[PDB]
């Protein structure tokens, strides 16, 4: 097949002009969508804050208006998912992955409205869920919509425009352009076959997405950590250790999300009325814990810089970690619309801090800063649970800008993905798709 290759080599990287321009518009819209979704979430959390002050005398009515304000918003988000687009429940990365395998539909006329408005309900109430899940599904659906509006034909167009929408989606959620591309190239792509996803086109959409985000967000960074210290060579083996601890934890957390999806299904049986009521109680618990112990609830981005600076006690970090493991499962396994990606950065940080502070007191000769271990651990639950380590590493690098830590970040991530493989765990997005494709057949 040599003369075939000579021809193909000579025809490499000539994506059709139409796909490239359309990639541009897909990115722009995904950017504007993500910006809007981001401001919408914030505006409701505010309304909720200003409610708690018209009510800040009567501590009992305080805890009540915290609970019902988030209960109402939660149910609303649960309800529109079950009523009009059930595949907008949970994250949405597994379904956009399925769409890329050509085994799940991109029902953009229904998911766009429910995922956007349903996510605002669940995130805006202060549930432990992220923007990533929403913005990538919303971004994929936006890809499909542009495809259907302009009736572009071919496998290339359908796969690329679907890929760039979910890439521009992650980029715009984190101000993280390199992470978005890599998430497609390492995780979301069809993993067992070649595809004609143009990468140059995914690149164009990511740019425009990221430019839209900078237009409405500049001057303030998602996570500001400052510059931490360097890592001496004789410190590296400690990051490997930390990796191995993430590698054992990764899969165990994956059991919990899945079996927790099972358990909480038992509660409502599948009934949209018991279900919406269940999410109303989970939502009320978060908006309540949001007042009574904020680090137990919410997306968790707030406590990342705090934990990195060593300003939490070890007692607090253990408490937060347990609690947040708990509230993270309850919210994502419940099937509320919204991601688990960003709360895993939090869980990783908190854990890595606690390792760091043990490492500082065991080795004063190392001159450790617990913060370097928090930075190594941030993308570590990502590496051992969803097994996209190159994406977590580039994402953490883009968000915290401590490139001098690249080696302990790599090392921690690979140990996590190595010990997750070696202890019998699977990529969580793939094991969520697989279970979803396994009852889209067992009903026959």
């Amino acid at each position: 097949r040599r003369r075939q290759l000579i021809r193909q080599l000579l025809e490499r990287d000539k994506t059709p002009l139409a796909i490239l321009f359309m990639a541009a518009v897909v990115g722009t819209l995904v950017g504007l969508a993500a910006v809007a979704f981001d401001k919408g979430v914030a505006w409701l959390q505010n309304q909720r804050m200003g409610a708690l002050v018209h009510t800040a005398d009567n501590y009992p009515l305080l805890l009540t208006v915290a609970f019902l304000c988030s209960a109402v918003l939660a149910m609303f988000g649960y309800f529109l998912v079950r009523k009009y687009a059930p595949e907008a429940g949970g994250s949405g990365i597994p379904e956009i992955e399925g769409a890329l395998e050509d085994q799940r539909p991109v029902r953009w006329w229904r998911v766009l409205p429910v995922k956007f408005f349903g996510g605002l309900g669940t995130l805006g109430g202060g549930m432990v869920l992220g923007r990533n899940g929403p913005t990538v599904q919303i971004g994929g659906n936006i890809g499909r919509m542009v495809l259907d509006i302009f009736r572009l034909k071919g496998d290339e167009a359908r796969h690329t425009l679907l890929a760039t929408g979910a890439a521009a989606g992650l980029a715009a959620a984190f101000n993280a352009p390199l992470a978005g591309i890599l998430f497609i190239i390492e995780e979301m792509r069809p993993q067992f076959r070649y595809t004609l996803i143009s990468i140059k086109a995914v690149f164009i959409g990511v740019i425009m997405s990221t430019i839209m985000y900078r237009i409405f967000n500049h001057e303030v960074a998602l996570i500001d950590v400052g510059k931490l210290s360097d890592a001496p060579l004789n410190t590296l083996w400690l990051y490997l250790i930390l990796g191995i601890i993430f590698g054992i934890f990764g899969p165990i957390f994956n059991k919990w999300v899945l079996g927790m999806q099972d358990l909480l299904h038992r509660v409502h049986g599948g009934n949209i009325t018991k279900w919406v009521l269940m999410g109303g109680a989970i939502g009320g618990l978060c908006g309540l814990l949001g007042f009574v112990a904020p680090a137990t609830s919410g997306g968790g981005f707030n406590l990342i810089p705090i934990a990195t600076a060593g300003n939490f006690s070890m007692g607090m970090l253990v408490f937060i970690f347990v609690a947040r493991v708990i509230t993270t499962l309850l919210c994502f396994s419940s099937g509320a619309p919204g991601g688990i990606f960003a709360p895993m950065l939090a869980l990783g940080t908190v854990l890595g801090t606690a390792f760091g502070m043990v490492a500082v007191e065991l080795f004063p000769q190392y001159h450790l800063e617990a913060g370097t271990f928090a930075i190594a651990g941030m993308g570590a639950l990502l590496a051992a649970s969803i097994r996209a380590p190159l994406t977590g590493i580039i994402l953490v690098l883009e968000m915290t800008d401590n490139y001098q830590l690249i080696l302990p970040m790599i090392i921690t991530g690979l140990g996590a993905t190595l010990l997750a493989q070696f202890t019998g765990g699977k990529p969580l997005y793939s094991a969520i798709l697989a279970r979803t494709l396994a009852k889209q057949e067992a009903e026959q």
């Epitope: 001496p232 060579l233 004789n234 500082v360 004063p364 000769q365 001159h367």
Partner: antibody, heavy 121, light 107 residues
Framework: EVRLLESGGGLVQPGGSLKLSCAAS????????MSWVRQAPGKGLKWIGE????????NYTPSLKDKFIISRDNAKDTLYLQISKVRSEDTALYYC??????????????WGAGTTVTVSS | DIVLTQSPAIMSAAPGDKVTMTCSAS?????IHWYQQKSGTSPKRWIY???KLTSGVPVRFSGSGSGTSYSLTINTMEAEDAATYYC?????????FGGGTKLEILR
């Protein structure tokens, strides 16, 4: 150049206190751990203590509760050493050092000239 | 703490001649440093990580060793090599210097 200029060492009466000062010039003095080492008359080098750039960690040699107090003010770019209940054992040349590492086994990167403490009635 | 003991506590040697001092530890130690001090002068970092020369340290100088015993060496002594040579460990905490080795000219 990179300069360490320590001052504040003089004659002090037994049981007194004193506050030595190291003035850093010619390098970003944030970023660096700073250290005190002293040399008693005709004797070897003895480590006092170290402070990290954010004063969040300060270690001292195995030696009594509020004997030494190391602190830094990275704004004026100067390192400090308070000595208390000073006895003649504290008669020494006092060195201020910038700390670094190669493979990660920490060494005394650059030293100042010293100041001499004499404690005597 | 780790005790480091430098061996020929004082010693003399003619110029253009091969000198060798020792450092020895109560326990095992890793990547030892060596500082050179002339009277009236700040100590100068001389050799680090048991074997590595500092920027400017002439090539005649060299270190070696492992575990519990280490060494400094000057293949061809010069005159400006007259000084005191302190070995230093931070493999353990807290870090400890040696007693010193004073090296003076022979004439």
């Amino acid at each position: 150049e990179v300069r360490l200029l320590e001052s504040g060492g003089g004659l002090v009466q037994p049981g007194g206190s004193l506050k030595l000062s190291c003035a850093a010039s010619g390098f970003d003095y944030s970023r660096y751990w700073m250290s005190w080492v002293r040399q008693a008359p005709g004797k070897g080098l003895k480590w006092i203590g170290e402070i990290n750039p954010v004063s969040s960690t300060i270690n001292y040699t195995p030696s009594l509760k509020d004997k030494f107090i190391i602190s830094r003010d990275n704004a004026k770019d100067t390192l400090y050493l308070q000595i208390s209940k000073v006895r003649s054992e504290d008669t020494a040349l006092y060195y201020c050092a910038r700390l670094y590492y190669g493979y990660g086994y920490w060494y005394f990167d650059v030293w100042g000239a010293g100041t001499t403490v004499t404690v005597s009635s | 703490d780790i005790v480091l003991t430098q061996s020929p506590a004082i010693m003399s040697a003619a110029p253009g001649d091969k000198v060798t001092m020792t450092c020895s530890a109560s326990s095992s130690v890793s990547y030892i440093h060596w500082y050179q001090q002339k009277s009236g002068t700040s100590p100068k970092r001389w050799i680090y990580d048991t074997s590595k020369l500092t920027s400017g340290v002439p090539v005649r100088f060299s270190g070696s060793g492992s575990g519990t015993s280490y060494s400094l060496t000057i293949n061809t002594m010069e005159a400006e090599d007259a000084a005191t040579y302190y070995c230093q460990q931070w493999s353990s905490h807290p870090q400890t210097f040696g007693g010193g080795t004073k090296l003076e000219i022979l004439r």
